[PDB]
């Protein structure tokens, strides 16, 4: 099997840690959801190809501009995350995360991922956002941002229900192989 490296980036509370936990355990933990993610090496078989995909989180590094880039050497695929319940997490994608990733990871594919898709039809979320003249991120807003930033593609998932999680990592493996 060939070895590839994946790193997930995004604002704090975009759900990147939870996404890595749910994928690596194949389950949303029923008893205790960990606070942090160390690393993991996933055995993935996609389109007949076997890959060892090493997974890394940048959670905790968002405020440290000289420590954070130490996560980037030899990355093969970037997952760039935002939360669908946070239109502000999407606004930081083009002028903060995208220029950073393009500088440290030139020519590395980026997959823009809209996390917490289950909150698009959550009434408490819609009420809270409506008080700030906002609404959950629409699918076309996510696709347009991915198109604008030069992303390899756009995907959505829910770590809470596991919907779409496997597909995100299978596509990330295919991108890493290209």
């Amino acid at each position: 099997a060939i070895r590839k490296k994946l790193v997930i980036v995004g604002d704090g509370a975009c759900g990147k840690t939870c996404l890595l936990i749910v994928f690596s355990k194949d389950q949303f933990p029923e008893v205790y959801v960990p606070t942090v993610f160390e690393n993991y090496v996933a055995d993935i078989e996609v389109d007949g190809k076997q890959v060892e995909l090493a997974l890394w989180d940048t959670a905790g590094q968002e405020d440290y501009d000289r420590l954070r880039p130490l996560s980037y050497p030899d990355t093969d695929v970037i997952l760039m995350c935002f939360s669908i319940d946070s239109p502000d997490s999407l606004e930081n994608i083009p002028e903060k995360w995208t220029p950073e990733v393009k500088h440290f990871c030139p020519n590395v594919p980026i997959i823009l991922v809209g996390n917490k898709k289950d909150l698009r039809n959550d009434e408490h979320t819609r009420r809270e956002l409506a008080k700030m003249k906002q609404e959950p991120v629409k699918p076309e807003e996510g696709r347009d941002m991915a198109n604008r930033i030069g992303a390899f593609g756009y995907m959505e998932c829910s770590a809470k229900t596991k919907d779409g999680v496997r597909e995100v990592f299978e596509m990330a493996t295919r991108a890493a192989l290209q």
């Binding site: 205790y32 606070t35 160390e38 993991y40 959670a59």
Partner: protein
């Protein structure tokens, strides 16, 4: 790691590590607080284990089996002895706090009510100065270590055979040389996340809420100082490239 500590931290949470008849005697808020303290100690035990893989399996294995040129092994594993001393001492204090809190007749039932004071001590005074100096040096030598590793693996047959041999076991799947270096660099930024969540469930005793708030501040001061003190070293860098930063 040693078997005794591995078994004490084998469960996915504190609520699954203690006996169910002991768990039932506590309020939900206490269980939530202890689950996060358990995660801090468990991840610290794993971090010390990562440092032992670097010092004992890789570093000492290369010194004893290979004929690498002087200063090459130090370039691959910068500051590992110092980092091991800092974290092994910290882990010893965390495990002793847990052990003193065990109920008589039990090796698994405990509640840690006073973590804040231990964290203030770790993240203040000489131990905090040493953590700041050591991570500022380690993180500035991180990229050079990765490049030296890649060069040796691509060009030296005995080095490649050594690496493939010692990393073959399934228990080393997540712990190759490059993976250990990044696990160590990332350790320090996990502390505020764990401490903030412990603090969220430590309001019952005002002394404890205040101590954890002080500890969170000290950890952030350490991270700010380390972040400001980093400048990537590069093998063969010229003075002109350095002073034109």
């Amino acid at each position: 790691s040693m078997e005794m500590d591995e078994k004490d931290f084998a469960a996915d949470s504190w609520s699954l590590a203690v006996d169910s008849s002991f768990l039932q005697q506590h309020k939900k808020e206490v269980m939530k607080q202890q689950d996060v303290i358990y995660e801090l100690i468990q991840t610290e035990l794993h971090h010390v284990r990562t440092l032992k893989i670097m010092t004992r399996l890789f570093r000492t294995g290369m010194l004893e089996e290979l004929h690498l040129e002087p200063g090459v092994v130090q370039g691959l594993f910068p500051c590992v002895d110092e980092l091991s001393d800092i974290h092994t001492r910290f882990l010893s204090q965390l495990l002793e706090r847990r052990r003193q809190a065990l109920c008589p007749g039990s090796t698994r039932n405990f509640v840690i009510h006073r973590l804040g004071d231990l964290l203030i001590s770790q993240f203040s005074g000489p131990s905090a100065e040493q953590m700041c100096k050591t991570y500022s040096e380690f993180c500035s030598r991180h990229s050079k270590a990765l490049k030296l590793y890649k060069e040796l693996y691509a060009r030296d047959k005995r080095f490649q055979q050594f690496i493939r041999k010692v990393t073959r076991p399934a228990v080393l799947k997540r712990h190759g040389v490059q993976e250990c270096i990044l696990l160590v660099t990332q350790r320090i930024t996990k502390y505020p996340l764990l401490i903030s969540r412990i603090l969220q469930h430590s309001h019952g005793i005002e002394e404890e809420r205040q101590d954890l708030t002080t500890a969170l501040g000290l950890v952030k001061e350490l991270l700010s100082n380390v972040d400001e003190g980093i400048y990537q070293l590069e093998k063969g860098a010229r003075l002109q490239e350095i002073y034109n930063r």
